[PDB]
């Protein structure tokens, strides 16, 4: 739902749908709590479409859960057809199953496993006979479709485009995301629940609006209005369509490209289930420490990423749980990813790692394609025994620490240096050294010779004593070439990064 | 006002022997002399236009320069506008084209 | 109606030609200013970009009423022939240049030449210290010939301007003969001559009889 | 027994270049200007071997061998009251003269040309001046 | 249930909703529509319609063929009855992710997958995007996704041996399959092979045991109940624009939600040649949802 | 009669071709202007969209008898073969193009090439300050060949115009030999030739003897 946008205006829609779906999850949690007469104190974790709760084990609670799930499934069927589907889960447990002095690890696993299994079974079998028959009734003669989500229901004309009702509401809400107050009315705004719509309203107009609940985004201060406080990663420097041009510096240096980074925490679910069970013979498996772990990740990824993104030309579209999606200028995207990884490895003492995919793209690239390709790169980075970063394709997959220590802050530095001392006539050998690194497996020993020759030519095309300075490159890039394949790939990526940095076009 | 091109044509007749000079590796086998620059096909001596342009420019630098130029880029306006100046925006392309001279009276010599 | 005419000739060099490639992508030879060569046969070539650029620059001196600071500011007579990325009606110029490849390699071999490119040794003499710094650069052999082809298209718009376009083409060829082809030609390089310059209609029906007589008489 | 194969000519060039004699200052007595014609002839022969058959290349190989021995016998440098022949030494240690006699087809010719390219690359890699 | 039709592609584009999206394999409604268009261009549309009206005609979604037929992962069988292990949670989540990523299994080990064994996907095709433009209006820069196959990997379907179907497949092999067919995508070479003895004995259509579907088939309304109570399935849309040589303007056909492959059930059902045409339309739009089943242990 | 004819040939480049692909798509290429390649073999290809668009543009200057601001107000001749989205009776054409993969990588390897693509270095010279800004463009090697294979479908109530369509296709192929394939071909890129250009019937029955001989004669 977030990433499937096909036309122009995909940035505003994309951020609006991200915020809309996070608020849908928050509203589901809060309305479920309201129906049982509980509050957010019973909410263990909300985010990423996943939410957990501790409830009373009564038949009334089970009934209210079933009827709420049925009502919201009907609402989702009416408003988004089969694109969005909510599945509910529950498992009965006792107090003795979570006290560290009385419980055992596999029971604390099974209390989660029961709800997970029942959610999985409900996800496999979604709709009954009547709902499926209602979906397959057909009988609609529509010439035209929605230009973003391709929906047929409730098509309207707007800015000479044809959008559905949901697309219309999301375009309207894209201008309302700048506010910090979001109210729930009965018919005004994007339909977020049964007879409930979400509308982003400025503070000064809040006294003129009728609502049932109000949310405040990114504020620890208890305001004059009793509101539910939510935290999301929403940093935004400029518009997405400007990020391609913003990669150029004041001197015009830099490729006119943009980057999209997708990052994921490694084995987050294993960390939640049994991350603490390794020590103390499993005595460390209770609800309290798991949910402190959850709040630690929540404060890291919904509040702290905004500070990591400060003074960077990028926008954080989705930042919740373990999945991180950012888009901006490519240099800032790489720097933001490296800084986030370092601050995470310092935050968690090294015990959890990330995997990152950083895709480069040109101007006006449709967002769904960017998200798909960056997801492939993230998956490739996961495939490299995890704790890996993949830059711009699957061939440059490195361990995060190897990319940080050896590539980003070692070779690329020892190339910007020597190579800002060479003209444009000698800044072409940078292409030649790339080809000899991509062609080492052909002609291994004469590709090495071809190097020795071509390196000693850059050190003669130089300038008087500026050449007593390129006497280091020859010794440097020779051993990088002759050690093994990993340093060859690292030097290849460093050269490609430098080429992208110094490009004038 | 209109664009035009004027060709100064002449015959360089040597009055003494001319030795411009090429490379020792590209001489004839068995020769220990200093070789002159030759055409790669006919193996006849030639007068490259770089020699003519350089000798002309150096000789004219003593006549039409008010101050002794440290380098050819320091030449006066006349010399820079005729022979070209890599460091002057308005005189990058000079209005003189020298050409390689080739032996023309080989039949008379024969 | 639509037609396409092919001007064909032999570019015969009268002096060594040095167009020039890149020192990065050269061979394992010694110090040289390498010329641009074919990847397959390693023979010197004349890229059509060089011919197009030299012809446009030379014809800007003649057919531009006002000195143009960019190629986009060229007159309509040159914009319609060489193209204009900033003009709606001149997006596709009607002239197509082709890379010229060495054509008399067998004749050169019968003349006993062993390399199709020579090395020319020059020096620069300081004006005060009078120290001679040497250098050597690569040139194509003097009497080499290259196959020159130029394709000119005639459409519904061009019919009233075909004769003027032929006049501009002849002027460009004559100016190229009276100038050098890309290289250090102020010092004697790049002198070329177009031999057997004839025009044949390769598509459509057209009469290039008088045009061919003009090519033979003027060249 | 072929001295030049597809598996050891680069290493042969490496050892040959390491065995070349030097001056009292450690500088190579051989210069690239001494072998410039030999390298040009090798490059032209390699370029022509791709298309033309070896039948018309035999004269070119013979002239290449004649140029190799002539440059071996011609180039001499006198330093510290002692004379040396850098091209002759390069030919002897690089084992070039009898590597030319085994050129019988296109493959052997291209092997020899690649061997010469490797010799030049490793000669420049070790401080070989121009 | 009779033959094992193989289509060796080089480039293909199977749009999943957008021009920049391309699936690895296509669904049986696409190939049935391709057959319908080839038959109507031939002129023998009525014969193919009569053949499709018969209950003998069976078709299945294309599956990968790499030295042996592959089958879609049976949705609904991660069951703990064969995957009960004492390993740590990290390995359990790793195998769960690996099984979730899995979409196709070799025929020789499908039952092995039901014994608790874990298998990984194999390199079949690379999906890459190409950007193209229009050099007369300088605003269109459209991206097209492909499914470039590799390692002698083809697609295969199972269908009855009919001469009309054989010649239709032979005309298909020079007409392309899905996507921008007149641009370098969709074309294939056809081969006819016999169903292996370990597979033909399992392809069934009528009994009351556990059956995994091979076709994106929507059951008739009579027996949807049995697919609802004891059926594991995935829901797939079949929307799009109905191709038509009779109308200048393009009409969106009715969105229809079928059952994917391989959805597991406890009993077989009957398919539908459902009319997804819009109202007031001259000719029909036929959507093929007729299942071929696979027996499970 | 339902038949399908298959014009098969080998497109041999006679100059370097630059069709050009996206920087991050056709692999991350260091060069500024990379050429489009196969995602696995990493060899240059000629996409069928390129051939179809260039052929339609070329035959749009001949078989249109008028001008068209869009590829919708086109001639019946072009619409019947390439297709027209807003016409009911030609919503899809009778021509099916295919990608042309590299077919002589073995021959290129035997010749001695190390790469199937080359870097061409050009520059632009300012018309005022006479300063040269360099530039690099990636091209496919000259003697590379690609398997061209184009299919034309003959159905019932369509045999009347076949003798026209044949001519159209032949003209288009000739124009593709008289023009450049996709790239900077006004400066020498992309000149191609068709080798073993013959058409065979592959489904159904048709007489292609006269078409086959006219393919070699008219070309």
UniProtKB/Swiss-Prot annotation, chain A:
Family designation: Belongs to the CRISPR-associated Cas10/Csm1 family.
Domain of life (superkingdom): Bacteria
Reaction(s) this enzyme catalyzes, per UniProt: 6 ATP = cyclic hexaadenylate + 6 diphosphate
The protein's role, per its UniProt record: CRISPR (clustered regularly interspaced short palindromic repeat) is an adaptive immune system that provides protection against mobile genetic elements (viruses, transposable elements and conjugative plasmids). CRISPR clusters contain spacers, sequences complementary to antecedent mobile elements, and target invading nucleic acids. CRISPR clusters are transcribed and processed into CRISPR RNA (crRNA).
Cofactor: a divalent metal cation
Coiled coil region boundaries: none
Domain note: The N-terminal HD domain has ssDNase activity. The C-terminal GGDEF domain has the cOA synthesis activity.
An annotated GO BP: defense response to virus
Residues shown, of full length: 254 to 758 of 758
Subunit structure, interactors included: Part of the Csm effector complex that includes at least Cas10(1), Csm2(3), Csm3(5), Csm4(1), Csm5(1) and mature crRNA. The Csm complex is elongated and slightly twisted with a maximal length of 215 Angstroms and a diameter of 75-80 Angstroms. It has been modeled to have a central protein filamant of Csm3 subunits along which the dsRNA helix of paired crRNA and target RNA binds. The filament is capped at one end by Cas10 and Csm4 and at the other end by Csm5; ssDNA is thought to bind to the N-terminal HD domain of Cas10.
Keyword Nucleotide-binding included in the entry's annotation: yes
Occurrences of domain GGDEF (ranges): 256-394
Source taxonomy: Bacteria, Bacillati, Bacillota, Bacilli, Lactobacillales
Keywords of the record: Antiviral defense, ATP-binding, Endonuclease, Exonuclease, Hydrolase, Nuclease, Nucleotide-binding, RNA-binding, Transferase
Name this protein carries in UniProt: CRISPR system single-strand-specific deoxyribonuclease Cas10/Csm1 (subtype III-A)
Known EC number: 3.1.-.-, 2.7.7.-
Cofactor details (free text): Degradation of ssDNA requires Mn(2+), Co(2+) or Ni(2+); Mg(2+), Ca(2+) or Zn(2+) do not activate ssDNase activity. Formation of cOA requires Mn(2+), Co(2+) or Zn(2+), Mg(2+) is not as efficient.
A GO MF term: ATP binding
Any further remark recorded for this protein: Encoded in a type III-A CRISPR locus.
Regulation of its activity: ssDNase activity is activated by target RNA binding to the Csm-crRNA complex and is inhibited by EDTA.
């Amino acid at each position: 739902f977030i990433y499937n946008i096909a036309t122009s205006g995909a940035a505003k829609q994309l951020k609006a749908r991200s915020l809309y779906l996070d608020f849908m999850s928050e509203y589901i949690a809060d309305s479920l709590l309201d129906k049982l007469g509980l509050n957010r104190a019973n909410l263990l974790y909300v985010g990423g479409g996943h939410a957990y709760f501790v409830l009373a084990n009564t038949e009334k609670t089970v009934e209210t859960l079933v009827q709420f799930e049925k009502d919201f499934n009907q609402f989702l069927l009416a408003n988004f057809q089969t694109r969005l589907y909510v599945a509910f889960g529950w498992g009965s447990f006792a107090a003795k199953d979570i006290m560290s002095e009385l419980n055992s690890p596999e029971s604390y696993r099974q209390i989660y496993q029961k709800a997970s299994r029942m959610i999985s079974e409900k996800k496999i079998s979604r709709y009954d006979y009547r709902t499926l028959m209602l979906l397959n009734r057909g009988g609609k003669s529509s010439e035209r479709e929605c230009e973003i989500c391709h929906s047929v229901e409730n098509l309207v004309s707007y800015h000479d485009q044809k959008v559905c009702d949901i697309c219309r509401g999301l375009y309207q809400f894209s201008k309302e995301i700048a506010h910090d107050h979001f109210i729930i009315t009965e018919n005004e705004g994007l339909p977020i629940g049964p007879n409930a719509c979400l509308k982003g309203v400025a503070f000064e107009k809040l006294s003129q609006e009728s609502f049932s609940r109000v949310y405040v985004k990114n504020d620890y201060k208890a305001g004059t209005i009793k509101a539910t406080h939510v935290f999301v990663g929403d940093y935004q420097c400029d518009e997405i369509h400007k990020y391609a041009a913003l990669s150029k510096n004041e001197d015009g240096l830099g490729i006119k490209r943009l980057a999209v980074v997708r990052l994921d925490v490694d084995d987050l679910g294993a960390a939640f289930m049994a991350g603490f069970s390794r020590q103390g013979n499993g005595q460390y498996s209770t609800l309290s420490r798991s949910a402190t772990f959850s709040r630690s990740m929540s404060l890291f990824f919904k509040v702290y990423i905004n500070q990591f993104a400060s003074d960077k030309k990028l926008s954080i579209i989705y930042a919740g749980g373990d999945d991180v999606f950012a888009i901006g200028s490519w240099q800032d995207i790489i720097a933001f990813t490296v800084e986030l990884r370092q601050n995470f490895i310092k935050w968690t003492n090294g015990k959890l790692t990330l995997s990152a995919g950083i895709g480069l793209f040109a101007d006006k690239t449709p967002i769904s394609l960017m998200a798909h390709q960056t997801g492939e790169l993230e998956e490739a980075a996961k495939g490299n025994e995890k704790d890996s970063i993949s830059l711009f394709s699957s061939d440059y997959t490195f361990k995060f620490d190897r990319f940080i220590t050896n590539v980003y802050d070692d070779k690329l530095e020892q190339i910007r240096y020597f190579f800002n001392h060479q003209d444009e006539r000698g800044k072409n050998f940078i292409y030649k050294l790339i080809e000899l690194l991509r062609n080492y497996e052909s002609e291994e020993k004469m590709n090495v010779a071809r190097l020795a020759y071509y390196l000693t030519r850059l050190e003669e095309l130089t300038d008087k004593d500026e050449r007593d300075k390129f006497k280091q490159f020859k010794k440097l890039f020779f051993k990088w070439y002759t050690n093994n394949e990993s340093d060859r790939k690292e030097a290849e990526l460093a050269l490609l990064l430098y080429v992208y940095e110094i490009r004038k076009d | 006002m209109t664009f035009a091109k004027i060709k100064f044509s002449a015959q360089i007749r040597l009055e003494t022997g001319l030795h411009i000079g090429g490379s020792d590796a590209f001489a004839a086998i068995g020769a220990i002399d200093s070789p002159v620059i030759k055409d790669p096909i006919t193996n006849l001596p030639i007068i490259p236009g770089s020699s003519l342009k350089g000798k002309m420019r150096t000789l004219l630098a003593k006549v039409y320069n008010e101050k002794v130029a440290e380098k050819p880029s320091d030449d006066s306006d006349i010399l820079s506008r005729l022979f070209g100046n890599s460091k002057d925006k308005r005189f990058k392309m000079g209005r003189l084209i020298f050409r390689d001279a080739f032996l023309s009276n080989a039949d008379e010599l024969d | 109606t639509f037609a396409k005419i092919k001007f064909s000739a032999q570019i015969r060099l009268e002096t060594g030609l040095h167009i020039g490639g890149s020192d990065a992508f050269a061979a394992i030879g010694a110090i040289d200013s390498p010329v641009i060569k074919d990847p397959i046969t390693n023979l010197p070539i004349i890229p059509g970009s060089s011919l197009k650029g030299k012809m446009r620059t030379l014809l800007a001196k003649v057919y531009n009423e006002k000195v143009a600071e960019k190629p986009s500011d060229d007159s309509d007579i040159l914009s319609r022939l060489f193209g204009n990325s900033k003009d709606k009606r001149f997006k596709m110029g009607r002239l197509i240049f082709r890379d010229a490849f060495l054509s008399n390699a067998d004749e050169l071999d019968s003349l006993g030449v062993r390399s199709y490119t020579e090395v020319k040794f020059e020096n620069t003499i300081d004006r005060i210290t009078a120290e001679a710094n040497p250098r050597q650069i690569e040139r194509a052999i003097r009497n080499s010939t290259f196959d020159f082809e130029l394709i000119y298209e005639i459409t519904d718009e061009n019919e009233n301007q075909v004769e003027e376009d032929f006049k501009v083409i002849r002027d460009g060829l004559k100016l190229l003969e009276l100038d050098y082809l890309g290289g250090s030609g102020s010092r004697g390089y790049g002198k070329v001559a177009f031999e057997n310059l004839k025009a044949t209609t390769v598509f459509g029906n057209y009469d290039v009889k008088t045009l061919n007589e003009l090519l033979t008489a003027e060249v | 027994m072929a001295i030049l194969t597809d598996e050891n000519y680069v290493d042969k060039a490496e050892r040959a270049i390491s065995l070349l004699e030097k001056d009292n200052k450690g500088n190579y007595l051989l210069t690239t200007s001494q072998i410039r014609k030999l390298l040009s002839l090798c490059s032209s022969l390699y370029d022509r071997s791709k298309e033309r058959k070896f039948d018309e290349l035999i004269n070119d190989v013979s002239y290449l061998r004649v140029q190799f021995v002539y440059q071996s016998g011609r180039n001499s440098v006198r330093v510290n009251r002692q004379t040396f022949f850098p091209v002759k030494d390069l030919v002897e240690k690089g084992q070039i003269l009898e590597a030319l006699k085994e050129i019988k087809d296109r493959e052997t010719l291209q092997r020899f040309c690649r061997y010469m390219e490797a010799l030049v690359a490793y000669f420049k890699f070790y401080g070989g001046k121009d | 249930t009779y033959k094992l039709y193989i289509m060796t592609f080089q480039n293909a584009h199977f749009g999943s909703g957008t021009l920049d999206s391309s699936k690895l394999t296509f669904s049986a409604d696409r190939i049935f529509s391709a057959l319908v268009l080839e038959a109507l261009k031939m002129g023998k549309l009525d014969a193919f319609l009569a053949e499709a009206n018969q209950d003998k005609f069976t078709l299945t979604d294309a599956f990968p063929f790499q030295f042996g037929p592959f089958l879609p992962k049976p949705i609904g069988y991660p069951k703990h009855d064969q995957i009960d292990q004492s390993v740590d949670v990290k390995e359990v989540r790793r195998q769960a992710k690996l099984s979730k990523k899995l979409q196709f299994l070799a025929l020789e080990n499908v039952d092995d997958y039901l014994n608790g064994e874990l298998f990984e996907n194999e390199e079949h095709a690379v999906i890459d995007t190409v950007t193209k433009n229009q050099p007369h209006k300088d605003d269109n820069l459209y991206q097209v996704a492909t499914t470039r196959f590799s390692n002698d990997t083809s697609l295969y379907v199972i269908a009855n041996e009919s001469d009309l179907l054989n010649e239709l497949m032979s005309s298909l092999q020079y007409s392309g399959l899905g996507g921008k067919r007149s641009s370098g995508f969709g074309r294939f070479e056809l081969d006819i092979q016999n169903i292996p003895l370990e597979l033909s004995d399992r392809l069934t259509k009528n009994h009351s045991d556990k059956v995994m579907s091979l076709t994106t088939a929507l059951p008739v309304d009579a027996d949807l109940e049995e697919a609802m109570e004891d059926g594991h399935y995935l829901l797939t849309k079949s929307s799009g624009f109905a191709f038509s040589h009779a109308t200048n303007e393009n009409y969106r056909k009715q969105d229809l939600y079928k059952f994917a492959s391989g959805s597991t059930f406890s009993k077989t059902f009957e398919g539908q040649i459902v009319d997804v045409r819009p109202l007031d339309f001259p000719h029909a739009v036929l959507n093929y949802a007729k299942p071929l089943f696979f027996k499970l242990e």
